[PDB]
Structure 1
Amino acid sequence: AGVKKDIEKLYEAVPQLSNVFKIEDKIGEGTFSSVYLATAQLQVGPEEKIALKHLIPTSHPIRIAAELQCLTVAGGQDNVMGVKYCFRKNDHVVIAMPYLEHESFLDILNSLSFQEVREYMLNLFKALKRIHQFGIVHRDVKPSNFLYNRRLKKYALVDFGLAQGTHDTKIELLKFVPASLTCDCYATDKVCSICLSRRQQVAPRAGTPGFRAPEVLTKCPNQTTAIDMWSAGVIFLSLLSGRYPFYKASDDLTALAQIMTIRGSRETIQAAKTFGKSILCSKEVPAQDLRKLCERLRGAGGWNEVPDEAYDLLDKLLDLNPASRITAEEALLHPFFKDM
């Protein structure tokens, strides 16, 4: 009913779709898009399942085209989703991708094996290595944007709607996407009318707060491909601990406080200095040993044999310092992936 009307409105908005696709169901309902499952006939192939991503028509054309261009230029290889076609009528743009049937991350956790964890992370790093080679910062790495088909052992990083370019990005369109006074409250628990009256610092939009790196949470102006590696580390932390969502926060500073309870308040404060942020935390909390944290959260019995290499890689992904944080290319060379 509610889905049936949405499908009817989509056919009305882009009438060409009615003569190509049998739209079966709504599989994504985000703030800025809706995704539908459809069946199509290939001219010189079999029938195919297709995901149709309808972008919110308030999106600027440049942002629409930049997302499409990530898929056309970087997609189709190394576990990065590609695109078959794109249909437009006025402000209604529908991206047609091959549909990858996939598991929900809660179902992944329910039958997870250690080798499956290794393969999942390996294939995530292959996709991140490729998009980072093109100078794309995804900004929204999380399980719902990384599709996994367990039966086929097939993977696809999707959703470039929040992506930004690096300075030397190879996605052309990503390039196109009173006075403040000092006071003596700095590095204290004080406020005053001077610091309270300054304007707000602004930063590009990122994804879910529980997957944002500390430099994103603190609104650092320089946000690099390292932010995606932090997000990958959060996925790994969920896999090793069995907890999802691991960080449960709807605002940035709550997420940061949770991160400090895992990685240490003093450690986070020292790292933040290097990207120009002063953090003060009235309650000091120690850094957690990652093996003990994951083993106690996941349960005992039996997964007690996880190798040291797994938690070492997790430490490098969750490096609070974005400069020393491991890269996707380096992660693929890490001892955790011996023989793969």
Structure 2
Amino acid sequence: KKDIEKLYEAVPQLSNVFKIEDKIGEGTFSSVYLATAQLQVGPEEKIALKHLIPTSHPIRIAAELQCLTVAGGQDNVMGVKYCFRKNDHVVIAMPYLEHESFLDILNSLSFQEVREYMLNLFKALKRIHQFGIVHRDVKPSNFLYNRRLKKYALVDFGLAQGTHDTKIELLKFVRAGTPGFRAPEVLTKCPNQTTAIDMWSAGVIFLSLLSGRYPFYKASDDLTALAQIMTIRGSRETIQAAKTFGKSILCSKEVPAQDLRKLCERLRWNEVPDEAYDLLDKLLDLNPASRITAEEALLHPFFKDM
């Protein structure tokens, strides 16, 4: 309420255009608000307004906008309608999509709905990865899901980096995500981090969906998450994989790799196919070179026929 007032004051032009109703999201680097506006084309429309923290470097602001303009608005990737600026305050106006809380729907989705969710996530990931965008903060709060409408939008390019050959110019001139969704090569600070790190994240999401638990890896720092990952995927397996990316991991307590089906079943629909756990295993590959890509994921037997 006081936040709404301060936003209007920071970007005065907003009061000419929007009736700002409520704050619908908040992260380290932004707050997202629900607002109403009148379209010239006729309809009134619900709008999401994303106020970026005024400490963002202009290049960071610009790179996020460029992701939205170039890659967004298609294939379950959020696009941008307009952008408002007064000085250091930038507000991105995007279409509003009404959406579920992940906690709410988690234990109430049918299995077919689990597979539709994952299929549609991989469509969004394939799209951004085609442009050489590494999202770096893929998690349920950044993947909008309208259960009723079966609509999906991947959001928030505010932590993105480019691949070596990225098609988003500003990304070459480039902030840490949630520990629980970060890949082993991320947690261990590998200098080379590719699109594979987002595929790991999608596997953590899939792990929550199959086990009925969220947040799966509940960790406030990177090494705690790594320790939790080792109890799932195995310490020896993690130590071996980390070598392939130039990291030496020592662990005092050896813990075995878990069977994924048994893990998810004990944590948690009557005949989940082997293909689901096989796909999970590929998503949670400890080696980022061998980890499945979004394009490969879409062709996985788990998704015949959709």
Give the TM-score band, short-chain normalised: over 0.9
Q: Percent identity?
A: 100
Deviation at 1:111, TM superposition (A): 1.6
1:289 maps to which residue? 259
Partners of 1:277 and 1:9 lie apart in 2 by: 46
The structure having more radius of gyration, on CA atoms, is 1
Q: Give deviations 1:303-339, integer Å, cap 9, x for gaps.
A: 2310000000000000000000000000000000001
- Counterpart position of 1:223: 193
Which residue of the partner structure matches residue 262 of structure 1?
Answer: 232
Kept after mapping to 2: 8 A contact 1:295/1:304: no
CA distance in 1, matches of 2:231, 2:199: 20
SS in 1 for 2:138: coil
Aligned-residue CA RMSD (Å): 0.7
Q: 1:107 aligns with which of 104, 107, 123?
A: 104
Q: What is the TM-score of this pair, normalised by structure 2?
A: 0.99
Q: CA deviation at 1:206?
A: 2.6
| CA displacement at 1:72 relative to structure 2 | 0.5
2:75 aligned residue (65, 73, 78): 78
- Describe the superposition over 1:117-159 as per-residue Cα deviations: whole angstroms up to 9, x where unpaired: 0000000000000000000000000000000001110000000
Determine the C-alpha separation between the residues in 2 that align with 1:320 and 1:59: 33
Write the distance in 2 (CA, Å) between the matches of 1:287 and 1:314. Answer: 14
Give the deviation of 1:110 after TM superposition.
3.1
> What SS class does the counterpart of residue 111 from structure 1 fall into?
coil
The Cα shift of 1:29 comes to: 2.1
Q: 2:282 aligns with which of 292, 299, 316?
A: 316
Per-residue CA deviation, residues 42-78 of structure 1 (Å, 9 max, x unaligned), is 0013111000000111111000000011001000000
Q: Deviation of residue 34 (structure 1)?
A: 1.1
Residues 1:96 and 2:93 aligned together: yes
Q: Determine if contact 1:125/1:332 at 8 Å carries over to the other structure.
A: yes
User: How far apart, CA to CA, are the structure 1 residues paired with 2:135 and 2:42?
Assistant: 32
CA deviation map 1:187-221 (0-9, x unaligned) = xxxxxxxxxxxxxxxxxx33100000000000000
Q: What is the rounded CA distance, in whole Å, between the counterparts of 2:282 and 2:25 in structure 1?
A: 33
Take 1:71 and 1:175, find their aligned partners in 2: how far apart are those partners? 16
- What SS does the aligned partner of 1:175 have? helix
Question: Within 2, Cα distance between the matches of 1:269 and 1:108?
Answer: 35
Partner of 2:28: 31
Cα offsets for 1:215-254 (capped at 9, x unmatched): 0000000000000000000000000000000001101111
Structure 1 residue aligned with 2:133, among 111, 133, 136?
A: 136
Give unmatched runs, 5+ long, in structure 1.
Answer: 177-204
Q: Could you list the runs of 4 or more consecutive aligned residues of structure 1 that deviate by over 6 angstroms after TM superposition? A: none
SS in 1 for 2:264: helix
CA–CA distance in 1 between the matches of 2:277 and 2:54?
44
Aligned residue number for residue 291 of structure 2: 325
8 A Cα contact 1:206 1:212, kept in partner: no
**Preserved contact between residue 79 and residue 157 of structure 1 (Cα < 8 Å):** yes
Q: In the TM superposition, what is the alpha-carbon distance from 1:107 to its structure 2 partner?
A: 1.3
Kept in 2, the 8 Å contact 1:238–1:245? The answer is yes
Cα distance in 2, alignment partners of residues 19 and 282 from structure 1 = 61
Moved more, 315-324 or 29-38: 29-38
CA distance in structure 2 between the partners assigned to 1:163 and 1:99 by the alignment: 22
Aligned length in residues: 305
